[PDB]
Design a protein around this ligand. Structure first.
Ligand SMILES: [Zn+2]
Ligand SMILES: [Zn+2]
Length: 402
């Protein structure tokens, strides 16, 4: 869908810090460094202690400038040295950390991503989404249609994506910049590309759509997304007898208005029969919701296992492997999925009027609830059959797997 997984997957692949412990009492060791501290050793010395594995790190005293300390880090099958500074927080550059462990964590993520995806990152910004996706005020949709923004460095709790170039904002802290006036979230370098179209009223509107599932759940402290509960309640309320439920789609324009309704009003959004007469609008907004999730309902880390289950012939091991896939999911994705499949089970019971069995429902939802994490999207297309059958299996046997 819209938000790009590449740089998010890379962050997951980044190697973790490996403190090389100096089993050593060292004279004039600063009380703020710990077991990683090695004092004044040679670089050959640092090289020999770091070679053991990727992400190994130590702190040592500089021979060129004594009384000053250097973080020595193993990455790319070689030793990278950074000058350390400390004033209550640890830092090598602009970013200020509470722990070296954290600093080194952000360090290795940066090295990994910036080195592996250099070209990609260089070019993330051609064909941006900014002027096409999102909101503005004339609250309307930009796609329907001068103040310099005010970007400050920001630390995002929970994974967030850049609203200019649509790519993941990587790192452990200060992964991007946020506008203090309107609230727009982008990359430092993307910040210089965003037009002077700041609309400060946009701060007031806390978004629901396109927000990380787990992040959103914790922010509101409710079991599942309010969009999921309300649409589901609305659908089952006016009836599951409607023909082509979830396969038929309402007007694009009004589905986006429902999405805008959720992003502006939240729990007080009006999705009644009075306001939107066509249930296909609500089904489309619910579908859309899942399709705006940065990480899809069935996570990228769970995808292979789910696809594996759908390849197996034995109905028992298939159901056993599929059950094992549900464990690979996070708690929020999992209870969101559980509720959805229970709803889709109820809709299939009314097959005689709505004509929507598990298979054809599985035609609609497979691709929505699943994306392959593979770079080649056209190649990833071969999986559609198995994405389709997974949801199908999840619907039928929902009653036992949950
Ligand atoms: Zn960006
Ligand atoms: Zn702004």
């Amino acid at each position: 869908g819209v938000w790009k997984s590449y740089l998010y997957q890379l962050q997951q692949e980044a190697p973790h810090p490996r403190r090389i412990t100096c089993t050593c009492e060292v004279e004039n060791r600063p009380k703020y460094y710990g077991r990683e501290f090695h004092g004044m050793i040679s670089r050959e010395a640092a090289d020999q202690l770091l070679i053991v594995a990727e992400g190994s790190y130590l702190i040592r005293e500089s021979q060129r400038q004594p009384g000053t300390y250097t973080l020595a880090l193993r990455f790319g099958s070689q030793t990278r040295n950074f000058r350390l500074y400390y004033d209550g927080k640890h830092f090598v550059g602009e970013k200020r950390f509470e722990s070296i462990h954290d600093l080194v964590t952000d360090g290795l993520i940066t090295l990994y991503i910036e080195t592996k995806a250099a070209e990609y990152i260089a070019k993330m910004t051609i064909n941006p989404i900014y002027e096409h996706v999102g909101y503005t005020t004339l609250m309307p949709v930009l796609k329907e249609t001068e103040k310099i923004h005010n970007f400050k460095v920001h630390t995002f709790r929970g994974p967030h994506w850049c609203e200019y170039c649509a790519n993941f904002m990587w790192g452990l802290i200060a992964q991007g910049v946020k506008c203090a006036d309107c609230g727009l979230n982008v990359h430092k370098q993307c910040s210089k590309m965003v037009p002077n179209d700041c609309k400060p009223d946009l701060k007031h509107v806390k978004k629901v759509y396109s927000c990380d599932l787990t992040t959103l759940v914790k922010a509101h402290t409710t079991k599942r997304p309010m969009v999921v509960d309300m649409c589901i309640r609305e659908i089952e309320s006016r009836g599951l007898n409607s023909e082509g439920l979830y396969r038929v789609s309402g007007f694009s324009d009004l589905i986006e208005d429902v999405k805008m309704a959720f992003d502006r009003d939240g729990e007080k959004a009006d999705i009644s029969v009075n306001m939107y007469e066509d249930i296909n609008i609500i089904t489309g907004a619910l579908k859309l919701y899942f399709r705006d999730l940065p990480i899809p309902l069935i996570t990228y880390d769970a995808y292979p296992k789910f696809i594996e289950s759908a390849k197996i012939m034995d109905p028992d091991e298939q159901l056993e492997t599929l059950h094992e896939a549900l464990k690979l999911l996070p708690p929020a994705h999992c209870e969101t999925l559980r509720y959805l499949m229970a709803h889709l089970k109820r809709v299939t019971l009314h097959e005689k009027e709505n004509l929507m069995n598990a298979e054809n429902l599985g035609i609609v939802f497979g691709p929505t609830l699943m994306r392959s994490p593979e770079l080649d999207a056209m190649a990833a297309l071969n999986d559609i059959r198995y994405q389709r059958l997974v949801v199908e299996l999840l619907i039928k046997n929902e009653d036992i797997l949950f």
